[PDB]
Design a protein around this ligand. Structure first.
Ligand SMILES: CO[C@H]1/C=C\C=C(/C)C(=O)NC2=CC(=O)C(NCCN(C)C)=C(C[C@@H](C)C[C@H](OC)[C@H](O)[C@@H](C)/C=C(\C)[C@@H]1OC(N)=O)C2=O
Length: 215
């Protein structure tokens, strides 16, 4: 009736500088942590620009979702804030290579900038804004579905490694879901008023609709 299923999980080590950056971010006392949302929203916009670009030539790539938008979903019960987009999504290699193992010139440049007095809010200018998620999350789970590929789950609690596996959770439409498992002292980002506030303050001019789902 219920034959056991089996799944192989792959664990990778973050490139040295990325691990260093995550450590700095996850432990920082920075007082303007709210910019994490702006960074994740900008990432979704980039993903949306990319699927839109592909649709310019191949309209069928939108069959998996014609609406290009961003959804924000807070969950107080399991203390998570999820940012979902119907962007291009990522392949398994996209996750393994571009979300952890391959060095990014911006990583060291950003840490050097901070040492030179830069502000953490500038992280996006160095192309490593995703990692700002750890300003408020103790763990980040990235669920992604690229056209013509399976759904994958990337996950890391910033202990120097991250995992990647074929997702067996709820199937999602094309796009990416960044699930922020918030730190116990950062639950304010689960509140409707707070979310509205930071979206209006840092992400009012986005090229795609953004919707907050409550209840
Ligand atoms: C975890 O989610 C993001 C993946 C990696 C992001 C990382 C490492 C990060 O910190 N910042 C980046 C933001 C980007 O927009 C971004 N896009 C290229 C350049 N324009 C912005 C100017 C990159 C480079 C690279 C990882 C893109 C992804 O590659 C599979 C993919 O091409 C794109 C589509 C994927 C993303 C931006 C993903 O976001 C969503 N929502 O899909 C960055 O590094």
């Amino acid at each position: 009736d219920q034959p056991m299923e089996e799944e192989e999980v792959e664990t990778f080590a973050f490139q040295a500088e990325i691990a260093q950056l995550m450590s700095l971010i996850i432990n920082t006392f920075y007082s303007n942590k709210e910019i994490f949302l702006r960074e994740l929203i900008s990432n979704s916009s980039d993903a949306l620009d990319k699927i839109r670009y592909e649709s310019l030539t191949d309209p069928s790539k939108l069959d998996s979702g014609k609406e290009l938008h961003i959804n924000l979903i807070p969950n107080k019960q399991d203390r998570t804030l999820t940012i979902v987009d119907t962007g291009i999504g990522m392949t398994k290699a996209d996750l393994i290579n571009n979300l952890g193992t391959i060095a990014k010139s911006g990583t060291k440049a950003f840490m050097e900038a901070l040492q030179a007095g830069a502000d953490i809010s500038m992280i996006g200018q160095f192309g490593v804004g995703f990692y700002s998620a750890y300003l408020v999350a103790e763990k980040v789970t990235v669920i992604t579905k690229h056209n013509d590929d399976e759904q994958y789950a990337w996950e890391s609690s910033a202990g120097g490694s991250f995992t990647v596996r074929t997702d067996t959770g709820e199937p999602m439409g094309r796009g990416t879901k960044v699930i922020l498992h918030l730190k116990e002292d950062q639950t304010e980002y689960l509140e409707e008023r707070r979310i509205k506030e930071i979206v209006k303050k840092h992400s009012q001019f986005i090229g795609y609709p953004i919707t907050l789902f409550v209840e």
